[PDB]
Structure 1
């Protein structure tokens, strides 16, 4: 079949900057003057969206900052000026021969200004406790860049191995990330201590921020 390769696989760029993505096809997709390469945009949780078809024609309804060029085996998608809404994975697709094939995808992220996270901590609910398990949750909200560090402490003992964390995709509203960390303990273990703390490290923090609660008192 025809294999398509995009480059880069990943990029990050300042708002407003010109962004170009390349697609190379293993064989020519040209047919009688036309070049059958297509581009899609796929945002988190949504279907891919057709931007460009036949290599250069802008699909109805798509903003004019998107343009396509190329011919034969080499094609380029250009965003003249990257807007916050344009966070997505971009795919090329050849329509010259079946099986119709897609590139491996290019992730485009917006590089915004540094923003510190807002930090929140949540005790487990009483409702959950009766099931025999306790989940403690730490929220890091609306920050940039994506790199952040969460440390769990239980009566000042550093917790390792009993947490998992998750990060949202970049929010197009403001180009920030949010992060969730969950500490899981048995009910018996949870009831054996008093002080639960979440210590957060991040570039926009001049020193680490800590949010905590007492399981007893409040």
Structure 2
């Protein structure tokens, strides 16, 4: 089949700067020298893909004019003149010329921005969840950059491991920050056994690690 290859796979871009994505097909995808069926789509998290460019160079109506596409033959390219926050997502090329029609593997556009420290919150388990036998304790890290954070749980000053899992949002389409939750899950049984429940966040935006905690 025809193999569309994109490059780079992930593309860091300072907001307001340009960006370019290369898509290269393994064979020619020109139809008859008359026309070339190549599209560029943008896919935002949890959304269907959105058409950006058709026939290599034509911008689809509605698309901001800071998007452009070009190329010819086996080498094509998508360009954003000035990147804006909502541009964050994944971008695919597509060849409609030779069946089976195929997509690229996608290029993830990551927005670079200034370091931003997280606002940290800790949540003790609901009375309701407790009666039903389990205990989930939630540590929230809100609106921070970069993605890399280190959340360590300490129960009565004892470091946990293997009983918590993190989840992270995608870059916010407005401020380009992340949010993270770490949930510590314990049996109601193992929960009463201790009193101090601590969440200790280590991040670039913090000079010293921040700890939010409670007792019971």
Q: TM-score range by the shorter chain?
A: over 0.9
Runs (4+) of structure 1 moved beyond 4 Å?
none
**Which whole-Å deviations, capped at 9, do the CAs of 1:9-64 have from their partners, x for residues lacking one?**
00111111110000000111112332211100000010000000000000000000
Give, in whole Å, the separation in 1 of the partners of 2:77 and 2:45: 23
Query: What's the counterpart of residue 66 of structure 1?
Result: 67
Give, in whole Å, the separation in 2 of the partners of 1:113 and 1:164: 27
Classify the secondary structure of the residue corresponding to 1:128. helix
Classify the secondary structure of the residue corresponding to 1:85. helix
What is the RMSD computed on CA atoms of the aligned residues? 0.6
Give, in whole Å, the separation in 2 of the partners of 1:58 and 1:74: 18
The yes-or-no answer on 1:93 pairing with 2:108 is no
Q: Tell me the TM-score normalized by structure 2.
A: 0.98
Query: What's the counterpart of residue 111 of structure 2?
Result: 110
Give, in whole Å, the separation in 2 of the partners of 1:11 and 1:173: 18
Classify the secondary structure of the residue corresponding to 1:134. strand
Give, in whole Å, the separation in 2 of the partners of 1:11 and 1:149: 24
Query: What's the counterpart of residue 14 of structure 1?
Result: 14
Give, in whole Å, the separation in 2 of the partners of 1:76 and 1:173: 26
Q: How many residues align?
A: 215
Give, in whole Å, the separation in 2 of the partners of 1:182 and 1:37: 44
Give, in whole Å, the separation in 1 of the partners of 2:57 and 2:34: 12
Query: What's the counterpart of residue 123 of structure 1?
Result: 124
Q: Compute the displacement of 1:72 (Å).
A: 1.0
Structure 2 spans left out of the alignment, 5+ residues: none
Query: What's the counterpart of residue 194 of structure 1?
Result: 195
Q: Tell me the TM-score normalized by structure 1.
A: 0.97
